[PDB]
Amino acid sequence: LGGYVLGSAMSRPIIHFGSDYEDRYYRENMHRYPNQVYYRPMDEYSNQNNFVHDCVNITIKQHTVTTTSTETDVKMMERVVEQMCITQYERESQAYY
Amino acid sequence: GGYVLGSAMSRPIIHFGSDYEDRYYRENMHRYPNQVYYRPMDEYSNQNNFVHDCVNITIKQHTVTSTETDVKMMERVVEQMCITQYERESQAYYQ
């Protein structure tokens, strides 16, 4: 809780699954998940653990509100958001110090 | 085949959107494997096909060798280890 900011677009990561169905589904459908994440702006209480934790949590919540679907899409959304939040951390911390 | 087994590595930190899953991993991460199988780096490798192959072969090896929760967790762990292995291998390969 504390104010989040919507980050700039980034290229969507390719997420890999051991199941052939899901692996292909992601390749074909990745263009439909967001390519931006909401995050808590970096300050003295921030570290990589809580930055990504907070980012994944709020981004997933906001996407539910914004979308006003399937089990498969939920699973994949969460994985792409985590990878994007890690990128966002690298962006915000290589700009903080 | 043409795969190798990697050295054991620190288990990855992974965050989940569900509070339950997020805590389950925290508490049960030590019971997923801490090494992956992968296609060793050569002039055809890049991050995408390396991770693709490593996830495919490692998951297949552990299927041959679960709750829905553990299967999800396992895949996330393997993918992060595969990404870390790529970083290690490509750094060495370009020397």
From Swiss-Prot, chain B:
Its primary physiological function is unclear. May play a role in neuronal development and synaptic plasticity. May be required for neuronal myelin sheath maintenance. May promote myelin homeostasis through acting as an agonist for ADGRG6 receptor. May play a role in iron uptake and iron homeostasis. Soluble oligomers are toxic to cultured neuroblastoma cells and induce apoptosis (in vitro). Association with GPC1 (via its heparan sulfate chains) targets PRNP to lipid rafts. Also provides Cu(2+) or Zn(2+) for the ascorbate-mediated GPC1 deaminase degradation of its heparan sulfate side chains. The glycosylation pattern (the amount of mono-, di- and non-glycosylated forms or glycoforms) seems to differ in normal and CJD prion. This is Major prion protein. Monomer and homodimer. Has a tendency to aggregate into amyloid fibrils containing a cross-beta spine, formed by a steric zipper of superposed beta-strands. Soluble oligomers may represent an intermediate stage on the path to fibril formation. Copper binding may promote oligomerization. Interacts with GRB2, APP, ERI3/PRNPIP and SYN1. Mislocalized cytosolically exposed PrP interacts with MGRN1; this interaction alters MGRN1 subcellular location and causes lysosomal enlargement. Interacts with KIAA1191. Interacts with ADGRG6. Belongs to the prion family. Changing residue 71 to I: In CJD; uncertain significance. It comes from Homo sapiens (Human). It is found in: Cell membrane; Golgi apparatus.
